[PDB]
Amino acid sequence: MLKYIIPTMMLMPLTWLSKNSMIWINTTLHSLLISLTSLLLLNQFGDNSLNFSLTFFSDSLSTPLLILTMWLLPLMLMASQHHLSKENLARKKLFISMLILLQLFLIMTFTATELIFFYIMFEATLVPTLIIITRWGNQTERLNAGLYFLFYTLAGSLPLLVALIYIQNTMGSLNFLILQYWVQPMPNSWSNTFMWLACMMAFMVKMPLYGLHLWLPKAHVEAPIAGSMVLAAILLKLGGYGMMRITLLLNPITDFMAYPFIMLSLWGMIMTSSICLRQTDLKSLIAYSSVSHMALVIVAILIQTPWSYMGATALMIAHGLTSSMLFCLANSNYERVHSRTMILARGLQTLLPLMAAWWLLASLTNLALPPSINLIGELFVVMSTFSWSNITIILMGLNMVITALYSLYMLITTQRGKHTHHINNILPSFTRENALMSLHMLPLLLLSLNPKIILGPLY
Amino acid sequence: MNPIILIIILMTVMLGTIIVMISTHWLLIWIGFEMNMLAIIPIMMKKHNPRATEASTKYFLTQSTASMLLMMAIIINLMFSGQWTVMKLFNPMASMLMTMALAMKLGMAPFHFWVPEVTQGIPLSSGLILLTWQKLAPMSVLYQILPSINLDLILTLSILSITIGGWGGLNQTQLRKIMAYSSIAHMGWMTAVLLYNPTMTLLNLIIYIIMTSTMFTLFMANSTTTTLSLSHTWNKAPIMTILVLITLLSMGGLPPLSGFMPKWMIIQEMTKNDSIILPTLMAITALLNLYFYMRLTYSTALTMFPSTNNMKMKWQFPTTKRMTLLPTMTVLSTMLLPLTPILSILE
Amino acid sequence: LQYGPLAYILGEKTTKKMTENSKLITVDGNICSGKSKLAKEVAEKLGLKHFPEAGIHYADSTTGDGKPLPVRFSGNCSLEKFYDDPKSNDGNSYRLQAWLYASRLLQYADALEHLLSTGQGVVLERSIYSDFVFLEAMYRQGFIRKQCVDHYNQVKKVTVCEYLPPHVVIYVDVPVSEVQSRIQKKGNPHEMKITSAYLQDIENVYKGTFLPEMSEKCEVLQYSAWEAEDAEKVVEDIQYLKYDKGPWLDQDDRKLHNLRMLVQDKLEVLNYTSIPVFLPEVTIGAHQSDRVFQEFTELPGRKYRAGYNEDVGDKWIWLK
Amino acid sequence: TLRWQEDPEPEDENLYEKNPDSHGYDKDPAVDVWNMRVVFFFGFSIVLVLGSTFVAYLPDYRMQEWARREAERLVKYREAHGLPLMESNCFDPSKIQLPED
């Protein structure tokens, strides 16, 4: 995995030695080149994973997440270069440096064979995002958002460190290839109950679980656009990857210790979708939609069936792309009208028709229009939960109805109706914004032709 | 103060610490302790204002009480063993008296009441000398007598120190009091891991010494003693704001910075001995230290507090302070985690 | 550094270079008291270095090329606007007074450094000990508020306490009527806006607050307008004084070494001028301060340290 | 009284005013058009097209086609000899020692 790490750290002298006007061009060009290079990880086998070294490996679960990260970095570079136009040059290079460092930590996180190295990278990802949010955010409460985000993550994750060290001392190794063959049943006791809680609560907070989600409509809102993109698209999936890796050691105690969180996440998505129905803020609405979709992924991982796992990884990738595009569209509206209120700027289809088409496509993929990979993941999770129990179909159908309701409410409020009279600074769409929208849309539509490369390690 | 007299007094402080470290006789340990304290008293009273004399008086009274308790423990050990070799003690009463004397000298809770007032009343350089160098000798004496230490007493002192240090540092606005409460919490950690593996204690002591030296050196480089005067630094030297940001993030134990390594290895050691509740409690309590560190970073580096007019007059002049070893300890306190297996040199 | 503890250990004693002519002389008076040419003629009689009166752009003269900077980089205040509109809404009066007090403190540090390092006497004009007179006059005229006076008193209390007073203070008595006649004869279009009440308040706080408190810690010579023109009488009076008052007598080598260590670090000199006391007059916003600092950095010869500016013609940077 | 000294909020800059041919990338027209060319070439012409071509011709991803061919071979071999196509036990019961009860 050194053939992707080394160009990523070589992006740092590229952005620190460029001219005053050529930092964006150089960084975008070379990050796109490394993103093209990242396709060599698709050498996957039906029986064995692609094991590079003692420290690094990449199976079919971590590969889509890696490709998503390395593709997402140039999108954030293209998105974040308009609101940093008047910034000091050193601060611009520091912003690009934090993005590069976050991408380095993310590509070292998904390939970590050892679990404690995964933990170290997974909590090293906290610092660049906290700095980005609390420094380049626009509002007063970005500091409070950073405090909430940091302390929720650390309070969830310190028992995970203690439990991982206990597993290392008891089993003798934290290597994931060893633990596949050396695993033992975990019996029913109070000690193992708190083992399960300690190993699970970090990823339940990071995903987030309903009731632990209070940091999300703050960190997703007071962040800049690049921060919101990397928080919605990748950082929520660290919890999913962690639960997929760590559930191997927690059997057969999961089958009854997963009941309260299954009830929290089945009822939680109804609550968050209903919250989405009555939101005055566009960014908060997108954040709560993210909470609902990650609740779906939580249920899929917790019922631990093959169809649920395939649906979970497909839904993770699809929701990352869709949430990134929605945050980009909301940011374009914010740059036009300088307010995040959904009722302020209305009827933009008469002024911005192609942006309205992009809005329609993003909304259609949000409500899982087949045959998008959104619908593939949601459908597979629905099938597996129906196999779990039958009233889950009632809950899933209600969730789908409310999801379509709030997605079309978003679209109809922002784009349709009579335009606002007193707003007259609605500039035509730039080529940069349209290129960003198309670079979010075209991979999402192309992946429906070959959806087998995003279906996890048990396709 | 004369430069030569200052030199002689500083070498007397180091000579007292060396005499404590190298000697095999309890009377020589006592002699080194009094030599160190007697020599360090004029460093506290360099400026000659009533606050310095008050701090010196409180420090003298606390150290004299601890020294008398130490002599009592030594005499009891001589009475019940007939020898003076610095090794395990032959009486539980002597062990308890010596452990509380060393706790009073280190300033661990509930004997912690002198540390923030003394640190506040003295200059930044003397406070750095105190909180860094004064703690090398009691930890060495504790390192020599661990077969006689009561486990319940030292663990109670450790958890009390950590909780009281975090809760105390939550409320402060002066930088020296924040540093004092941070010191109290870190000595709680160090004596928590003492009885299981003292090499982890040495590693934590070294890392805390480097981080405290970096933070104090930045403080005297910018001549800031309060929160707001530190918040003025963004309009004078932003590189110092970046340095205090990364050092305060590393002081909170956030990975992948070098401050994560001591508590990581301490938790690794404590779980080998089937102690799981205490490392979790200590981590959850260290979140408070992280909280007031993050509040300092908010006020200093991640926001731009309003400045005044005379900052332009300060712009027109460069700094000339001898910021000794500041880049070295700035690097060594942040990017030392990939060299974690270097701790085997301390065994 | 050029001077430090190592030099003082190696025999650099300041009392060796301190002769009997090494005195600090401060000349005071009203606005057009004619103390300037008296200070010049005193300085060229005993052979002392003359420091002209510090203005807004004194620190610009000390650093860089010595040319005056634009007003938005130094001062952010106008004397002419103070004369035209003393009761302005933007608080120009106290901002100018605070900047001038900081400039006078810097000049006093420079004078003390030259005196202690070369052993030569220094003639000053209106040092920091005679700066609060203008503040008190501005307060008595209602130009500034009470909070400005409190801020000035705090800054003065934490700054002037570690410096030594002048050896001789010379005061020139010119009445307010003659001062007004001189300022209309001068021809400055803004100096004719000065009211008689301001000059009367300046004279009152010179006579009733400054001289009684400075005659105890130093020696005060006071002259009228016509007898101030005879500089030979003044230099005779200075040469025939009996120096037995003030803290200059009980100064050994250690105290003056500490003072010289203080006055050669200009950032340590001006440490307490920018204390975090938020007054509407002197508090600058974050965006304005950032914009002005980024503009100031881009000035020629100001981006880096003094010896490390390539664009102004410095070489051997890679070996420095 | 009057508050602290602070610049007012600057007016928003219209990028289409000074440059009607702006792509929104940079204020200098040359840097802006070169950024557009870089993004459009290395994003669509290089990454998307050749990436889709690479994914389309992946050499038997996760052995699915090989599994189908081997299943055809095994079904033919077992059907020819009258063998059952699949047994209820994955491992031989002869080489398994059940616990005695």
């Binding site: 626009n138 | 402060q172 606005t173 929160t227 926001t303 507090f305 309003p306 | 938020f278 508090t283 | -």
Partner: peptide, 19 residues
């Protein structure tokens, strides 16, 4: 429209004897 930076009240809250 621009970034929010702390006012006099923010620093005045942060600058007491005790928090």
């Amino acid at each position: 429209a621009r970034q929010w930076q702390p006012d006099v009240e923010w620093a005045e809250q942060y600058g007491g004897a005790v928090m």
